[PDB]
C-alpha cells in the first residue's frame, strides 16, 4: 500500500482507471472525425480544426485523471484504446450529432463516478470531479446542441451550402 | 562540353528543357483563366487573383529549372509557348476542374522526369525534383480538389450565389 | 477513386495506415512510462517530463501521416491502440532501454515503408519519409543510446543516487 | 455586345490583342537573354539581372493591356508566344543591341496603335497609350542607346575586360 | 556492435571514413592556396580570404561526416592528411582552376558514396548526402566555373591588372 | 630573396615551418579526442565540446604562424598531418592526461624555437613567440593539470559517476 494513500477506496481507483480509458477513447473518436473533414471529397477545414481541438482537450482530461490516480496513491492500469465506431462520419451534422451523443455518455460515466465517490465518502474525489469535469461536460453538451440546432435549421445535411457557411461563420 | 558538367546525361538535359516549356505553358493557362474572371460579365475578382497568383508561381518554377539547367552545365533551348486550350472557361467550377487536370498532368511529367533521373543515376537531379517540385504538386492538387469539392457541394455551377460566396469566403 | 489520387499504390496506402497505428502505439507507450515516473514511490519528475514530451511528439508524427494519407487520396483506416507491454517499467535505465528498443522497431517499420515506396516508384512518398521521419529516428536512437550509456556508467539501476542525479543534470 | 462597351472600335480591340502578344514575346526574349548571361561560360551576373528585370516589366505591360481590354468590354484572344530569335546572344554588347532593336519595334507598334485610336476617335485609348507606354518606351530606348554607346567606347565586345567592368559599374 | 547501429553496412562505414579524409585534405589544399595569396610577392588579399573561407567550410563538412559516423554507430578511423600537390599555385586563375578540379573530384567521390548507399538500401545515408552535400557541390562548381570564365575573359593570367580588379570587384 | 626579408635566418624559417605542422597535428589530435566523446558508448558531450574548442584554437595558432612566415618573407612549406596516436582514448581522465602530455611537447618545441631565435639575434621572432605562444601554453598546461587532478581525486577513471559529474560541473 502506498505511503500517500488515504481514504481512497479500491472501487474508486478502478473507476478512475475506467474513466481514463473512456477519455482516451473519446480523444480517438474526435481524432477520427477531424481527419474525415480533411478528406479532399469532404473539405470542411474548420470542422476538421474544431474536432482536432476537441481531440487534444480529451487527451488532456485523460492525463489529469492519470495525475489524480498517482496523487491519491492508486495505480494506473491502461487498456486498449478501441478504434472508433465509424470510419465515415457522413456529414458535418452527423458528426456533431455523434459528438453530442459521445459527450452525454462521457457525462453519464462521470456522474456514476461522482455517485460512487459520494457512496464511499471521498469528498476530495467528489470535488475533483465537480471542479474539473462536470461543468466542462455541461458546457460542451450545450455547445454541441447549439451547433446541431443551427445546422438543422440551416437545411443540413442536404444543403451543402449550409455546412459550407456554418464552417465559415460559426467554426471559423 | 561545359567545364562544370558532371554526371548530367543528355536525356536529362532534354527533359529539363521540356519541363521548362510545360511550366511556362501552365503559367500561360493560369494567366488566361485569371483575366476571364476579370471580365465585366463574369466579375469574380478573387477567382481572378487566385489564378494570377498561380500564374506567377508557375513562371517562378520555370525560372528555377532554367537556373538548374545552367547549374549543371546544360544548355537551355526554348520553344513556343502554346496558347491555352480555351478562351472561355465557362464558370469558376469549370476553371478549378481544368486547373486540377493541368496540375496532375504537370505532376505526371515531373514523375517521369524523376524516373529518368533515377534510371541515369543522377541523385542531385532526383533530390532537386523532390525538394522543389513533388510536394508542391501534391499540395496544389489537394487544394484544387478541396475547391472543386466545395463548389460542387455548394451547388455550382448552376447556383451563381455559390460561386459568389466561394469567391468571398474561400478565395478572399 | 479520389480525384486527387496519382501514383499512389494500394500497398502504400495500407502501409501508411499501419504506420499510423504504430506511431499511436508508441505515443501510448511513452504516456505509460511518463506517469510511472510520476508515482510517489518512483518520483523522478524529469524522467516523467521527458517521456511525456516524447509521447506528444509521437502523436504529432501520427497526425502528419494522417494528413499525408488524405493528401495522396488514400483513406485512413484506424485500428485499436494496444495497451503497452508493461504497467511497471522498473527503473529509469530500464525505461530508457525499452524506449531505445521501441524506437529501433519504429525505425525498422519506416525503412520497410521506404523500401515499398521505392519498389512502387513513389518518389513523393520516399521523400516524405526521408524528410520527416528517417533522420528524426536516427537522432532519437542516438540520444537514447547516450542516455542508456550514461545511466549504466553512473551505476544505475542499483544506485538510486545515479538516477536522481541523471534526472537533475541531464533531463532537467 | 458587352454592357460596358462604349466608343470601342472592333479594330482597336484586335490591335490591343496584337499588342498583348507582342509584349509577352518581348518578355520571353528578355527571359532568354537573362539566362544566357547566367551560363557558366558567360557569367555576367548583372547583365542577367538587368534582363530578368526587363522581362518582368514587359509581362506587367502585357497584363495592363489585358486589364484595359476587359475595362473597355473587348475580349482577350491569346496567341502562341513565339520562341525568341536566338538561343545564343553572343556578348553583352550584342544583347544590348538586340534589346534596342526590340524596343524600337515595340515602340513602332505602339505608335501605329495610337494612330489607329486617333483615326477611330477613341481619346481614352489614346491617353492610355500616352500615359503608360509612350514615354516608357522613349526612356527604355534612350537607356539602351546609352548602354550600347558605353560598351562600344569601352572596347566591347573584343575586350572581355570592358564587359566585366560595365557589368560591375553600370549594371551593378 | 553498437546499440544504435541499424541498417548501416560495413562498406558504408568505411566509405564515410574515406570521405572524412578527403574533406580534410580539401580543407588543407584551400589553406595552402589562401596563404599563397598572402605572400608579399603575390598580394591578392581577397583571393586569400576567399580560399580561407573555403578551407573552414570543408573542415565543417568533415566534422558533419564524423558526427554522422557516430550517429549511425560506426567508428571513425582517421588517416594522415596528405600535404597538397603544389606549394606554389602560380596565379589567381590557376588556383581557381585547381579548386574547380578539386571540387569535381570531391563531387565524384560523393556520387560514388550515394551509389553505394543506394546499393545497400540505406535511405537515411542517401538523404544525408543529398541534403548536405550534393547541391552544395553543384553550387561550388558552378561558382568556380563562373570565376574561371571571368578571369580568362579579363585576360588573366598575363594581365596582372585583371587579377587585381577581379580581387577587388568580385571577391571583395 | 623576398623584398621584405630582413634579419630572418634560414634556420628560423625552417623551424617556423616545423612549428606550423606541429600545431596542425595537435589540432588533429584534439579533433580525434572530441569525436571519441561523441560516441554513443562514451557520451560525454562537454568533454567533446571542450576538445573541439581546443582543436579550433590550435588551428588558429597554426594560421598565425603561417601569417608570420609570410610577414617575414619566408616561404611556407607544408607537410603531411600525421594521424593521431590513438583511435580509442579510453576515458575522460586518459584523454586529459594525453592532452597535458601533448601541450608540454608543443611547449618544448616553442622553447627550442625561442632559443634558436635568441641565438640568431631575431628579437622580433622572440617577442612574437613570447606574446602569442608562451603564456598561452603555460595557461593550457596549468588548466589541464587542474583537470587531471580533480578527475583523479574524484575517483576517475573507475568511477563513471566522477566523469559524468566533471563533465557537468567543470566542463559544462
Ligand atoms: Ca473493435
Ligand atoms: Ca495552337
Ligand atoms: Ca492486449
Ligand atoms: Ca531527398
Ligand atoms: Ca518558331
Ligand atoms: Ca494626355
Ligand atoms: Ca606526400
Ligand atoms: Ca602513421
Ligand atoms: Fe472529457
Ligand atoms: Fe477492437
Ligand atoms: Fe468534453
Ligand atoms: Fe509548377
Ligand atoms: Fe499553336
Ligand atoms: Fe503548381
Ligand atoms: Fe515516431
Ligand atoms: Fe489487447
Ligand atoms: Fe521518435
Ligand atoms: Fe513594353
Ligand atoms: Fe514557332
Ligand atoms: Fe520597355
Ligand atoms: Fe566539401
Ligand atoms: Fe605524404
Ligand atoms: Fe565545397
Ligand atoms: Fe598551440
Ligand atoms: Fe603516417
Ligand atoms: Fe594550446
UniProtKB/Swiss-Prot annotation, chains A, B, C, D, E, F:
GO cellular component, one term: autophagosome
Segments forming domain Ferritin-like diiron: 6-155
Gene3D superfamilies: 1.20.1260.10
Entry binding sites for Fe cation 2: 58, 103, 137
Subcellular location, principal: cytoplasm
Pfam families: Ferritin
SUPFAM superfamilies according to UniProt: Ferritin-like
Tissue specificity statement from the Swiss-Prot or TrEMBL entry: Expressed in the liver.
Annotated site, Essential for association with cargo receptor NCOA4, chain positions: 18
Cellular location(s): Cytoplasm; Lysosome; Cytoplasmic vesicle, Autophagosome
GO MF terms, alphabetically ordered: ferric iron binding; ferrous iron binding; ferroxidase activity; identical protein binding; iron ion binding; iron ion sequestering activity
Enzyme Commission number, as recorded: 1.16.3.1
Keyword tags: Acetylation, Cytoplasm, Cytoplasmic vesicle, Iron, Iron storage, Lysosome, Metal-binding, Neurodegeneration, Oxidoreductase, Phosphoprotein
Catalytic activity: 4 Fe(2+) + O2 + 4 H(+) = 4 Fe(3+) + 2 H2O
Protein origin, superkingdom: Eukaryota
Positions that bind Fe cation 1: 23, 58, 61
Gene Ontology biological process: immune response; intracellular iron ion homeostasis; iron ion transport; negative regulation of cell population proliferation; negative regulation of ferroptosis; negative regulation of fibroblast proliferation
Functional description taken from the UniProt entry: Stores iron in a soluble, non-toxic, readily available form. Important for iron homeostasis. Has ferroxidase activity. Iron is taken up in the ferrous form and deposited as ferric hydroxides after oxidation. Also plays a role in delivery of iron to cells. Mediates iron uptake in capsule cells of the developing kidney. Delivery to lysosomes is mediated by the cargo receptor NCOA4 for autophagic degradation and release of iron.
Subunit: Oligomer of 24 subunits. There are two types of subunits: L (light) chain and H (heavy) chain. The major chain can be light or heavy, depending on the species and tissue type. In the human liver, the heavy chain is predominant. The functional molecule forms a roughly spherical shell with a diameter of 12 nm and contains a central cavity into which the insoluble mineral iron core is deposited. Interacts with NCOA4; NCOA4 promotes targeting of the iron-binding ferritin complex to autolysosomes following starvation or iron depletion.
Disease: Hemochromatosis 5: A disorder of iron metabolism characterized by iron overload. Excess iron is deposited in a variety of organs leading to their failure, and resulting in serious illnesses including cirrhosis, hepatomas, diabetes, cardiomyopathy, arthritis, and hypogonadotropic hypogonadism. Severe effects of the disease usually do not appear until after decades of progressive iron loading. Neurodegeneration with brain iron accumulation 9: An autosomal dominant neurodegenerative disorder associated with iron accumulation, primarily in the basal ganglia. It is characterized by global developmental delay apparent from infancy, and progressive decline of motor and cognitive skills. Clinical features include delayed walking or inability to walk, spasticity with hyperreflexia, ataxia, dystonia, and poor or absent language.
Family the UniProt entry places it in: Belongs to the ferritin family.
Protein name: Ferritin heavy chain
Gene behind the chain: FTH1
